[PDB]
Design an enzyme around this catalytic site. Structure first.
Site, PDB file in Angstrom:
ATOM      1  N   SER A  73     -18.284  10.608   3.511  1.00 11.17           N
ATOM      2  CA  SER A  73     -17.111  11.423   3.839  1.00 11.17           C
ATOM      3  C   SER A  73     -17.385  12.931   3.840  1.00 11.17           C
ATOM      4  CB  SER A  73     -15.935  11.115   2.882  1.00 11.17           C
ATOM      5  OG  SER A  73     -15.418   9.796   3.056  1.00 11.17           O
ATOM      6  N   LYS A  87     -16.863  14.732   7.054  1.00 11.33           N
ATOM      7  CA  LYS A  87     -15.539  15.091   7.561  1.00 11.33           C
ATOM      8  C   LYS A  87     -15.375  16.587   7.689  1.00 11.33           C
ATOM      9  CE  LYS A  87     -13.616  10.799   5.884  1.00 11.33           C
ATOM     10  NZ  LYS A  87     -12.650  10.105   4.979  1.00 11.33           N
ATOM     11  N   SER A 105      -9.546  12.302   1.893  1.00 12.76           N
ATOM     12  CA  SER A 105     -10.624  11.494   2.443  1.00 12.76           C
ATOM     13  C   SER A 105     -10.084  10.338   3.285  1.00 12.76           C
ATOM     14  CB  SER A 105     -11.563  10.981   1.359  1.00 12.76           C
ATOM     15  OG  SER A 105     -12.871  10.840   1.880  1.00 12.76           O
ATOM     16  N   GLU A 112     -15.559   5.685  11.097  1.00 10.76           N
ATOM     17  CA  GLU A 112     -15.088   5.043   9.876  1.00 10.76           C
ATOM     18  C   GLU A 112     -14.720   3.586  10.167  1.00 10.76           C
ATOM     19  OE1 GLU A 112     -15.352   6.444   7.130  1.00 10.76           O
ATOM     20  OE2 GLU A 112     -15.470   8.583   7.591  1.00 10.76           O
ATOM     21  N   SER A 166     -18.507   8.929  -0.532  1.00 11.71           N
ATOM     22  CA  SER A 166     -19.008   7.774  -1.265  1.00 11.71           C
ATOM     23  C   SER A 166     -19.317   6.684  -0.259  1.00 11.71           C
ATOM     24  CB  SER A 166     -18.004   7.292  -2.313  1.00 11.71           C
ATOM     25  OG  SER A 166     -16.775   6.974  -1.687  1.00 11.71           O
TER      26      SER A 166
HETATM   27  C1  LIG Z   1     -16.164   8.756   2.509  1.00 12.27           C
HETATM   28  O1  LIG Z   1     -17.093   8.918   1.790  1.00 12.27           O
HETATM   29  C2  LIG Z   1     -15.143   7.680   2.232  1.00 12.27           C
HETATM   30  C3  LIG Z   1     -15.752   6.313   2.424  1.00 12.27           C
HETATM   31  N1  LIG Z   1     -15.967   5.444   1.548  1.00 12.27           N
HETATM   32  C4  LIG Z   1     -16.551   4.205   2.074  1.00 12.27           C
HETATM   33  C5  LIG Z   1     -15.617   3.433   3.026  1.00 12.27           C
HETATM   34  O2  LIG Z   1     -15.338   3.867   4.180  1.00 12.27           O
HETATM   35  O3  LIG Z   1     -15.142   2.320   2.665  1.00 12.27           O
HETATM   36  C6  LIG Z   1     -17.034   3.284   0.958  1.00 12.27           C
HETATM   37  O4  LIG Z   1     -16.625   3.416  -0.147  1.00 12.27           O
HETATM   38  C7  LIG Z   1     -18.040   2.183   1.304  1.00 12.27           C
HETATM   39  C8  LIG Z   1     -18.418   1.332   0.095  1.00 12.27           C
HETATM   40  O5  LIG Z   1     -18.507   2.201  -0.998  1.00 12.27           O
END
Ligand SMILES: *C(=O)C/C=N/[C@H](C(=O)O)C(=O)CCO
Length: 264
Positions: free
Chosen positions: A46, A49, A106, A142, A213
């Site tokens: 993220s 972004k 996010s 995403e 993440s």
């Molecule tokens: C940005 O960092 C938000 C994304 N998080 C991802 C997702 O899109 O689901 C995850 O957490 C993937 C597994 O951890």
């Protein structure tokens, strides 16, 4: 990089936390940098972004509204983590609202809308190139851009590249003064970063940051930091782990931030 017992401290932290750590700190007070694996690629997750929202801000310089344009939110649009876009299914959100949602919650639908709107991941990458960032690459939408698979160069950048770009965007003149201020306002209003870089900084310091993440316990944060009575810092902390379902380690980013802001 300060001795380099900053380097030894980061090496310790990395090894103790059992992952791969990437750090790039820019001190605008004297232009110094502290670098740790700063030229290795990490999955942005993220933190990408910021580049998407910045690409939209840059286009708004030649399309005077743009941020007021409405974007339809559909039922099917839900990726899902999207805590804001949901209150607008079968409604719309402005590009300003999608930027804010992507940057401060996010929101993953908001990200997809920003990407779509500049023309897809390749045009986000092209915006990075126009900023002189030769390393950033956005390849997917995403949620797949967060897979963060080791060896996979998709959706990656280096800490050094991301720190210099973030400097140019939030402090430099990559954006117009109006657009720069809007980006800083958005990142300062982030709600997801209290446990990451901010957790490692004196409580009085003002932070604008974007977390990320992903798979492999990837835990990221990129921040512009105004310590008071001080010139601002840009700090990128990227962290990834070897097991596919490792848990997030936002505390590692806080520790990295403490370590490299020590002496400051
Ligand atoms: C940005 O960092 C938000 C994304 N998080 C991802 C997702 O899109 O689901 C995850 O957490 C993937 C597994 O951890």
């Amino acid at each position: 990089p300060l001795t380099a017992d900053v380097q030894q401290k980061l090496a310790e932290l990395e090894r103790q936390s059992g992952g791969r750590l990437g750090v790039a700190l820019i001190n605008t007070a004297d232009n110094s940098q502290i670098l740790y694996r700063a030229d290795e690629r990490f999955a942005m997750c993220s933190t990408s972004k910021v580049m998407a929202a910045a690409a939209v801000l840059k286009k708004s310089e030649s399309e005077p509204n743009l941020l007021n344009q409405r974007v339809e939110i559909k039922k099917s649009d839900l990726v899902n983590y999207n805590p804001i876009a949901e209150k607008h299914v079968n409604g719309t959100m402005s590009l300003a609202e999608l930027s804010a949602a992507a940057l401060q919650y996010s929101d993953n639908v908001a990200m997809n809308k920003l990407i779509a709107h500049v023309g897809g991941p390749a045009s986000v990458t092209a915006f990075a190139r126009q900023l002189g960032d030769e390393t950033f690459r956005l390849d997917r939408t995403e949620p797949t851009l967060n897979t963060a698979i080791p060896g996979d160069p998709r959706d990656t950048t280096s800490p050094r590249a991301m720190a210099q770009t973030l400097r140019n965007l939030t402090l430099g003149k990559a954006l117009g003064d109006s657009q720069r201020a809007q980006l800083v306002t958005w990142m300062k209003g982030n709600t997801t970063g209290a446990a990451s870089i901010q957790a490692g900084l004196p409580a009085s310091w003002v932070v604008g940051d974007k977390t990320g993440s992903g798979g492999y316990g990837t835990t990221n944060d990129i921040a512009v930091i105004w310590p008071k009575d001080r010139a601002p810092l840009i700090l990128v902390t990227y962290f990834t782990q070897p097991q596919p379902k490792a848990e997030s380690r936002r505390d590692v980013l806080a520790s990295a931030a403490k370590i490299v802001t020590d002496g400051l």
